[PDB]
Design a binder for this molecule. Structure first.
Ligand SMILES: [Mg+2]
Ligand SMILES: [Zn+2]
Ligand SMILES: [Zn+2]
Ligand SMILES: [Zn+2]
Ligand SMILES: [Zn+2]
Lengths: 588, 151, 105, 76, 75, 49, 49, 129, 215, 99, 80
């Protein structure tokens, strides 16, 4: 189990008032992720801490991040958070007081550059505070080239590890500032109780990483210590023993392929095996206590069902520092309302601390792989209904009520009507030609946003699509209303009955049994579609075809999908016969 | 509630008063036993004989098995809308007012549970399992502290 | 807040002379009476105000997961309406895609 | 305890003092009355409770709950 | 902590001359009786000191030795 | 096989001893300690040597 | 340089899988059998009925 | 490079809140021996403890007597029993046990161990037979 | 068992409160039982409900929709509330013996009363005015005409005096605002809720008999 | 991951000064990337001095071996020396594939 | 791994007809399955396969245990 990347996670109550954590991943599952933490402190300060490979554990005042990228005007910096500096509103007032207070709060570490309006000085200060090799703070200042080198290195680092999912070049600094202002806006919205904090147990903001992702995470740290470091040490030793001008292209090659390949003593294979065997727990690489993000267990061959269930096991993430030893302990072990259809509601350990800790995929649930985000990005940016982020400003978004559009958590533009765009792209996905069937199209009606998700680790299950005649029903209602208004005695004769049903037929059941029909054919024909827990919040599902048949003419219960009831159980839970006739704890 | 006729007393919000009214309305009456005993030969029914003589089981067990489970209560309250804002499950609409959307199980165990009913029952059973699991640890902590304070 | 006219910066309040004297780090002063006599603000029923659910109530008729009831819309005469229940007081709002709203909302 | 997988430890006192104490102080007859509730701990359970009810009931579905001498002897 | 010196070695202890097994029901045993498998009865031993009053009773145990039950293992 | 904290608590609640002694000393690491009684420090005693 | 990855913090390769991975929790685990002196081989004595 | 056997650093957080002058003489520093005590036996008519043996006292008497009969065995009992436990139990029941029960009422600071000596052969026996 | 605030009895919360000797502020399920000081009127359920609702703690903050502190004296005006001078002059006319005093300072709070909470809690404007006036020495309080229906609000402008200011002026003014908000409008401090329960008690009657009373 | 996230550009202080150029040199910049990465199927050696043969999973299970495939890397190293005169010398070497 | 030589419950020699039963059941099933794939036979909601007459013709009595163990036992060679 892993929290969703490129997603703001907020946590209000349980001297820091609130925390907003955003982990940014520029591309697929194998890219380095940068974690930014935004904290409102009781002192009034809003601090942004960026944890990355380059540097971490440094809380910078929020306005300094905007100042380093050229946005030095306080009005423009605050405008990134409130989106309109000349709107009375009610959230705007509260946000403006908080931001004005946070600007003037004195910070112990960034005291000299707090009131600095020149971005070069702030960049230099951050470079000195961040660079490992700058242990002499005064010697280099005499050399102008040294200052330029530090500034360039810091700018490159900032472009690489500050919101890399929104871009990694210098062309997207202002877009990154807009996104950061949006994140601060969301955090302050939660602060004023407009929003509740992020549900830690909900699967709408959760991902499941197995094999490839976890092995890649372990492999990065193992490679950096077993290959890069030995080669660096060998090259250093060769240059210290042999004069640089004496190398004849043979010393370099042997030093490369003998420094790491003679005194291995740790091995890439041995370290990968240790990562696989240790499991999801804290471990020590190079005497550094890092957390192994690989969830593994011994293959206990009690039976074949045990092996299959082990291969379909979803494990909660383990962290040493907190491990959630509060009321959260029994909150995370409960059956969450987002589980049905994706996580088996019955499978769990019945004894010990492992009760509800280990989850099982439901029978029809699948793990999505990373889709081609680039094609959908090109389609969305070329969509006339979507105004690109470069062509719209915060004033236009807030005054015209524009709806933000996200793909894999990246804000790529705004649309006039979020619902229409979401429905049109859902229809395109149903066609399956220009939109891949495994993409998530989520519409947040509370804030009018459309989110496209194609990242790895998405739980997905196929759901039969329920279609209705609501348009014809509404037209008949309008015709009957016109007849009544004209003064007709049998105006009700124009009304038609409501019809909702699936297109699934017993003949397709026989074709599936005959092997001539597959789930891919059903998805291509539009009979069924794949639904993600985040997209499931946009769905109203009939729990069975019996329920759908009962409400066939019920215009007040317009299901979007119909479920097969056995899809809420895992393989081991389905072994129990008449499980719905048994107490569910006994099914566990 | 729809006509704005529910007036909470002093000390409760309309939501709390409505939840209390719903919890009181969905309790099984005493006459739920009448159909059960009309179908049961007490001089011959093994289940009734075990329940009535105190060997095993209780009246709620028989009622759940034969008539219906009823309202699923967790911490004295009904099922919370945790699926989304105002939604308890993907199977029920937002701001649903029916009792079934909030954990009321209308089916007995012998009749079989539907998928949402089974999900609510699984939530209750998982609560039971969690409480049983952490009872051992909490009792161990308290017992060790009390023993060392009193030994 | 007051934004300094020379440098786009926020200026402190520093009530000294019986009125507000907006002081900036660049030394500029604006005086600025009348409009900025409000020093502190706090709304105590946030999370239940009108603008909290404004977007949701606007989008409620188009949300397929919202509860519907068999009630006639007085505007377009549809036989069904979207039913909302927001707040700790369980405010019931009936909305329609035609724009009709049940008085409150 | 219950018979569903429970494991119990058993050790036989070998020394004379421990044996004296086991048969004089720690015998389960001393724990028949609970130290906690001041009441009895043991009694009929499950099949024994139902059997006592079935044996002491006035009537069966077959008439009066009676047995002949042979089956009355077999009870003992 | 639990695995530390105090709690694991002083407040509790590993012991010799002890057995563990699964428990099952036996309605033919009295409430103050326990059914002991014979293989465990030839593993755990009772130390009886030979005196004038018990020599006759303990002699069959000595004669049985380790070959027949009830016997003995060490003297 | 371990006789833990709770087993000792149960045995001492019965007021047993002589079984705590047997199991925890005779069937465990129970030994003999020698103390000088004049300074309280562990003394060195050997009968044979 | 900024592009170099040789001196990259390898603790950052392990992406956070939980929200509060840095907050320190001092309380004891409510599900840990730490004050219960029970052998690990008889853990099914705690199994639910 | 990967080490698995971590030691789990251990932290204590709740601090305790317990509530001429020359170098040292041979009296204040030292004298760990503790002064010897004299046995002040309470007179038989001043005793306040029960004239009935507790189950603890009777059990200890039987255990001590049986352990002594394990190494000894010169017995004053009439009937012959084949176990030291039975012999000790009958000795207690026949009021022939050669032991006494001392109940240390108080140890005084002045160095007196005030005790009550009870004869189990004139005491109530609560044991079963 | 209940898990909500003020009645948190789930888990070992109550036993740990008991065994750890946790202070009063650390208790999550604190309760009290009060007997009427009149043996002959304990039988009236209506009187018991009256007393229970009377001792229920209601503060000023419970009844505030929003509040705004202002640097304006009176004997200028934030533009968003320039319409307040109508009911302000109405209050001046309707309260001849409540003219502003000659120590009125710049600081003053303007609070909007929540009418829904006032209706539900049976809180009257006069109750607020008298529970703040005969409570606060250095203050001058003004209310709108309570006749307000749905659409026009009840506004309470509390004007401060330099006797309170007698540290930064704005910060101490905000602290005074906090002190005023936490004032007890009704009830007894620390009592979030107060229900009425039927008590079973024994009393000896005139015949020397011990009778169990359920009423 | 190897070709993009593991590029090395590190400058180390010169530690030798027993030559005029050695005193001139104060740093050397080591710069290399990886160009070819490929993982093969698990292999094993029988003779201890023979050709590598396919290692089947049952043999790895029996012998306690690791079902691991060889990783072959090809790299391009760029070494740059720096002197106290503003010039730099570049020695560019290409590493052939190696396990 | 095979149909047991005798019924586990009563010891009736059901293994005398185990091979004949297996073959005849395969032949009979082939005449009842239509277009459904062999692995989808346990999923066909229209299938009604009764082996009562086959077992009776084998001479096996109407015993719950014997017919159960005859029709339900898994053959190892059919899965390996
Ligand atoms: Mg058990
Ligand atoms: Zn300025
Ligand atoms: Zn309408
Ligand atoms: Zn000494
Ligand atoms: Zn048979």
């Amino acid at each position: 189990e892993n929290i969703r990347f490129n997603t703001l996670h907020i946590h209000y109550h349980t001297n820091e008032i609130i925390r907003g954590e955003f982990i940014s991943q520029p591309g697929g599952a194998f890219e380095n992720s940068s974690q930014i933490i935004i904290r409102y402190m009781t002192t009034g300060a809003i601090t942004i801490e960026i944890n990355s490979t380059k540097f971490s554990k440094l809380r910078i005042p929020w306005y300094l991040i905007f100042r380093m990228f050229g946005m030095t005007g306080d009005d423009s910096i605050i405008e990134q958070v409130v989106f309109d500096l000349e709107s009375n509103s009610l959230v705007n007032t509260f946000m403006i007081e908080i931001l004005e207070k946070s600007i003037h709060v004195l910070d112990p570490i960034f005291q000299p550059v707090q009131h600095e309006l020149n971005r070069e000085k702030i960049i230099q200060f951050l470079s000195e505070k961040v660079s490992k090799f700058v242990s002499n703070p005064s010697a280099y200042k005499s050399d102008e080239n040294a200052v330029q080198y530090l500034n360039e290195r810091q700018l490159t680092i900032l472009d690489k590890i500050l919101l890399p999912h929104m871009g990694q070049t210098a062309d997207t600094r202002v877009r990154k500032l807009r996104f950061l202002g949006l994140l601060i806006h969301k955090i302050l919205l939660v602060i004023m109780n407009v929003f509740p904090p992020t549900d830690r147990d909900s699967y709408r903001t959760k991902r499941v990483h197995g094999s490839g992702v976890s092995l890649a995470k372990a492999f990065k740290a193992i490679f950096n210590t077993s290959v890069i470091a030995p080669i660096i040490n060998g090259f250093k030793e060769l240059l210290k023993q042999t004069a640089f001008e004496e190398l004849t292209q043979r010393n370099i090659i042997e030093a490369f392929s003998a420094a790491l390949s003679k005194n291995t003593a740790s091995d890439l294979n041995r370290s990968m095996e240790q990562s696989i065997i240790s499991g999801n727990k804290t471990i020590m690489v190079r005497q550094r206590p890092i957390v192994n993000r690989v969830s593994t267990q011994s293959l206990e061959r009690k039976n074949l069902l045990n092996t299959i269930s082990a291969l379909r096991t979803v494990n909660t993430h383990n962290t040493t520092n907190a491990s959630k030893q509060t009321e959260r302990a029994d909150m995370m072990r409960r059956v969450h309302a987002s589980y049905p259809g994706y996580i088996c509601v019955a499978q769990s350990a019945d004894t010990g601390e492992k009760v509800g800790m280990s989850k099982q995929l439901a029978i029809t649930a699948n793990v999505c792989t990373a889709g081609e985000v680039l094609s959908l990005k090109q389609r969305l940016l070329s969509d006339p209904a979507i105004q690109q982020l470069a062509d719209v400003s915060n004033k236009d978004i807030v005054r015209k009520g524009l709806a933000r559009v996200f793909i894999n958590g990246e804000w790529i533009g705004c649309c006039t009507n979020a619902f229409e765009l979401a429905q049109r792209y859902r229809m395109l996905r149903r066609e399956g030609k220009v939109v891949h069937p495994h993409t998530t199209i989520y519409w947040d009606s509370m804030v009018d946003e459309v989110e496209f998700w194609l990242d790895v680790g998405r739980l997905t299950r196929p759901l039969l699509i329920v279609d209705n005649n609501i348009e014809k029903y509404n037209q008949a209602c309008y015709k009957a209303a016109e007849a009544r208004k004209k003064g007709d005695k049998d105006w009700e004769k124009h009304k038609i009955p409501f019809i909702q049903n699936t297109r699934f037929t017993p003949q397709m059941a026989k074709d599936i049994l005959a092997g001539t029909l597959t789930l891919e054919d059903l998805v291509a024909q539009g009979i069924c579609e794949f639904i993600t827990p985040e997209e499931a919040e946009n769905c109203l599902v009939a729990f069975s075809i019996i329920e759908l048949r009962k409400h066939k003419h019920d215009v007040t219960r317009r299901f979007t999908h119909v479920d097969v009831p056995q899809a809420i159980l895992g393989l081991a839970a389905l072994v129990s016969p008449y499980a719905n006739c048994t107490q569910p704890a006994r099914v566990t | 509630l729809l006509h704005g006729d529910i007036m909470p007393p002093i000390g409760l919000t309309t939501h709390d008063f409505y939840e209390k009214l719903q919890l009181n309305a969905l309790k099984f009456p005493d006459r739920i036993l009448k159909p059960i005993m009309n179908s049961i030969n007490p001089e011959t029914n093994g289940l009734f004989q075990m329940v009535a003589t105190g060997a095993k089981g209780s009246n709620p067990n028989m009622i759940h098995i034969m008539a219906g489970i009823g309202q699923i209560e967790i911490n004295t309250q009904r099922i919370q809308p945790q699926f989304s804002f105002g939604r308890t499950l993907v199977y029920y609409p937002r701001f649903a007012l029916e009792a079934q959307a909030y954990g009321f199980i209308c089916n007995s165990y012998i009749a079989g549970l539907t998928s949402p009913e089974f999900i609510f029952g699984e939530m209750n059973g998982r609560f039971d399992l969690i409480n049983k699991a952490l009872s051992t640890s909490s009792t161990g902590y308290a017992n060790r502290k009390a023993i060392f304070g009193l030994q | 807040m007051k934004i300094c006219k020379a440098c786009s910066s926020c200026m402190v309040r520093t009530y000294v002379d019986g009125n507000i004297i907006f002081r900036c780090s660049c030394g500029e002063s604006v005086q600025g009476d009348s409009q900025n006599l409000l020093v502190s603000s706090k709304v105590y029923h946030t999370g239940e105000m009108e603008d909290k659910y404004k977007i949701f109530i606007k989008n409620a008729p188009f949300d397929p997961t919202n509860c519907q009831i068999k009630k006639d819309c007085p505007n377009c005469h549809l036989d069904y309406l979207t039913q909302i229940c927001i707040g700790s007081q369980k405010i019931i709002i009936l909305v329609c895609r035609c724009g009709y709203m049940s008085n409150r909302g | 305890a219950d018979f569903d997988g429970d494991q119990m430890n058993l050790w036989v006192p070998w020394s004379v003092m421990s044996r004296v104490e086991a048969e004089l102080l720690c015998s389960v007859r001393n724990w028949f009355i609970s130290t906690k509730s001041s009441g009895p701990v043991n009694g009929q359970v499950q099949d024994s409770t139902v059997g006592s009810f079935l044996l002491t009931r006035t009537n069966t579905p077959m008439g009066k709950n009676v047995m002949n001498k042979l089956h009355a002897m077999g009870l003992f | 902590r639990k695995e530390g010196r105090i709690r694991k070695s002083l407040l509790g202890s590993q012991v010799w001359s002890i057995s563990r097994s699964t428990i099952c029901g036996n309605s033919d045993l009295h409430l103050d009786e326990v059914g002991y498998p014979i293989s465990f009865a030839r593993t755990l031993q009772v130390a009886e000191t030979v005196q004038h009053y018990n020599i006759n009773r303990l002699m069959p145990y000595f004669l049985n030795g380790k070959r027949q039950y009830p016997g003995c293992s060490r003297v | 096989l371990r006789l833990g904290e709770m087993e000792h608590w149960v045995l001492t609640a019965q007021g047993a001893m002589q079984t705590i002694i047997e199991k925890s000393h005779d069937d465990s690491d129970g030994c003999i300690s020698y103390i000088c009684r004049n300074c309280g420090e562990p003394a060195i005693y050997n009968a044979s040597h | 340089s900024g592009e170099d990855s040789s001196m990259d913090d390898i603790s950052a390769y392990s992406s956070p899988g939980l929200f509060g991975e840095d907050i320190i929790d001092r309380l004891d685990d409510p599900f840990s059998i730490e004050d219960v002196d029970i052998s690990l081989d008889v853990l099914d004595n705690l199994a639910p009925q | 490079l990967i080490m698995d056997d971590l030691v789990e650093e251990y932290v204590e957080t709740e601090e305790e809140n317990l509530v001429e002058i020359v170098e040292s003489p041979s009296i204040c520093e030292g004298f760990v021996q503790a002064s010897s005590q004299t046995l002040v036996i309470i007179p038989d008519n001043e005793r306040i403890t029960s004239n009935v043996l507790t189950t603890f006292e009777a059990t200890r008497l039987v255990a001590v007597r049986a352990q002594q009969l394990a190494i000894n065995g010169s017995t004053m009992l009439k009937k012959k029993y084949s176990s030291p436990i039975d012999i000790a139990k009958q000795e207690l029941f026949n009021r022939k046990i050669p032991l006494l029960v001392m109940r240390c009422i108080k140890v005084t600071p002045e160095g007196q161990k005030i005790v009550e000596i009870w004869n189990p052969r004139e005491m109530g026996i609560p044991l079963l037979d | 068992r209940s898990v909500a605030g003020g009645t948190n009895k789930s888990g070992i919360v109550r036993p740990q409160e008991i065994f750890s000797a946790k202070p009063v502020e650390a208790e999550q399920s604190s309760e009290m039982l009060l007997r009427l000081k009149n043996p002959e009127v304990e039988t009236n359920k209506t009187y018991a409900q009256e007393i229970a609702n009377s001792i229920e703690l209601i503060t000023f903050e419970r009844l505030i929709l929003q509040w705004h502190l202002l640097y304006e004296t009176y004997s200028v005006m934030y533009p968003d509330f320039a319409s307040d001078v109508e009911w302000m002059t109405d209050f001046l006319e309707n309260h001849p013996l409540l003219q502003p005093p000659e120590d009125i300072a710049n600081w003053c709070i303007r609070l909007e009363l929540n009418k829904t909470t006032m209706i539900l809690k049976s809180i009257s404007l006069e109750s607020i005015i008298n529970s703040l006036r005969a409570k606060h020495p250095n203050t001058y309080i003004m209310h709108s005409v309570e006749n307000t229906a749905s659409g026009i609000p009840i506004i309470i402008r509390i004007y401060l005096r330099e006797s309170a200011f007698r540290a930064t002026d704005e910060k101490i003014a905000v602290n005074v605002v906090d002190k005023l908000l936490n004032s007890t409008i009704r009830g007894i401090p620390g009592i979030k809720n107060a229900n009425v329960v039927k008590l079973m008690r024994h009393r000896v009657d005139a015949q020397g008999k011990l009778v169990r009373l359920d009423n | 991951i190897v070709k993009q996230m593991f590029n090395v550009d590190i400058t180390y202080k010169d530690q030798r000064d027993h030559t005029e150029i050695d005193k001139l040199r104060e740093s050397v910049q080591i710069q290399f990337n990886f160009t070819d990465v490929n993982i093969e199927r698990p292999q094993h050696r029988n003779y201890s001095q023979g050709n590598k043969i396919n290692l089947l999973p049952n043999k790895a299970r029996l012998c306690g071996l690791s079902y691991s495939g060889p990783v072959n890397l090809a790299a391009e190293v760029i070494l740059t020396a720096h002197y106290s005169n503003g010039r730099q010398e570049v020695k560019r070497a290409s590493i052939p594939p190696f396990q | 791994m095979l149909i047991p030589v005798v019924c586990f419950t009563c010891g009736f020699p059901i293994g005398t007809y185990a091979a004949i039963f297996d073959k005849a059941r395969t032949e009979y099933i082939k005449t009842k399955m239509g277009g459904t794939l062999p692995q989808n036979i346990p999923l066909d909601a229209s299938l009604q396969i009764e082996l009562k007459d086959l077992i009776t013709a084998l001479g096996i009595p109407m015993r719950v245990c014997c017919r159960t163990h005859l029709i339900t036992t898994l053959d190892y060679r059919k899965y390996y």
